[PDB]
Amino acid sequence: HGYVASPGSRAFFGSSAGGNLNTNVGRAQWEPQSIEAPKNTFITGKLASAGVSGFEPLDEQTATRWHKTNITTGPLDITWNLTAQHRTASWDYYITKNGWNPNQPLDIKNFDKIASIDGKQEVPNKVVKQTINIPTDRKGYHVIYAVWGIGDTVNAFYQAIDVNIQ
Ligand SMILES: [Cu+2]
């Protein structure tokens, strides 16, 4: 169990630690760390919730629905907080393509992978800090999809992150 705290994930921003910068986020208000589903679950319109019961409100998609963190292209530091550390296989990061439609349901086919970090089947610390590169053809509202792949189960934790690239 874990979430991306910086830039705050859509789920994290639903919690008090995230400033309640997103409202009406279901279970994300209290447990943004709990978005767990089998690896390679990428159901269109169910990316933000990973199809998990109680997280459905996260799946709404419009240009203005969610709070964005202002970022630039180039290097971006990602910080996870893990409420329950687990042996780790992988960390993968995707971002929406230039030209994507922010008023349509999220579809993984409209993202590119932009980073992949081997967890080496080790147990990470409670705070995990990684740097990824944001491609320079992205401007404006984009969604980053951060996926923590568990080493000793068939599951992953899924974190949609709303950013404004300027
Ligand atoms: Cu867990």
* Location of structure tokens 């459905």: 56
Q: Which residues lie closer than 8 Å to 106 by C-beta, 6 or more apart?
A: 44, 45, 47, 48, 59, 61, 143, 145, 160
What resolution, expressed in A, was reported for this entry? 1.5
Q: How big, in percent rounded to 5, are the helix, strand and coil portions of the chain?
A: 10, 45, 45
Annotated binding residue 1: yes
Q: Given the DSSP bridges, would you call strands 88-96 and 155-165 parallel, antiparallel or unpaired? A: unpaired
Q: Does domain 1-166 fall into CATH 1.10.357.10?
A: no
Phi/psi region, residue 91 (left: phi>0; alpha: psi -120 to 50; beta: rest), is beta
CA distances (Å), origin 40, targets 36, 44, 72, 108, 150? 11, 12, 29, 10, 12
Query: Which tokens is 77 given?
Result: 């530091």
Question: What single-letter DSSP state applies at residue 8?
Answer: B
Method for this entry: X-ray
Distance (Å) from CA 86 to ligand 1 centroid: 6
| Amino acid, res. 16 | S
Angle CA 51–55–61, to nearest 5: 85
Taking the C-alpha atoms of residue 140 and residue 155, their distance in angstroms, rounded to an integer, is 32
Mapping DSSP to helix (H, G, I), strand (E, B) and coil, where does residue 53 land?
coil
Query: Which tokens is 63 given?
Result: 């240009």
Domain residue ranges of the chain, discontinuous segments joined by +: 1-166
Enumerate residues with CB within 5 Å of ligand 1 (an ion): 1, 84
Distance (Å) from CA 101 to ligand 1 centroid: 32
What are the backbone dihedrals phi and psi of residue 145, each rounded to the nearest 5 degrees, phi first? -115, 110
**Contact at 8 Å (CB) between 90 and 142?**
no
| Amino acid, res. 118 | D
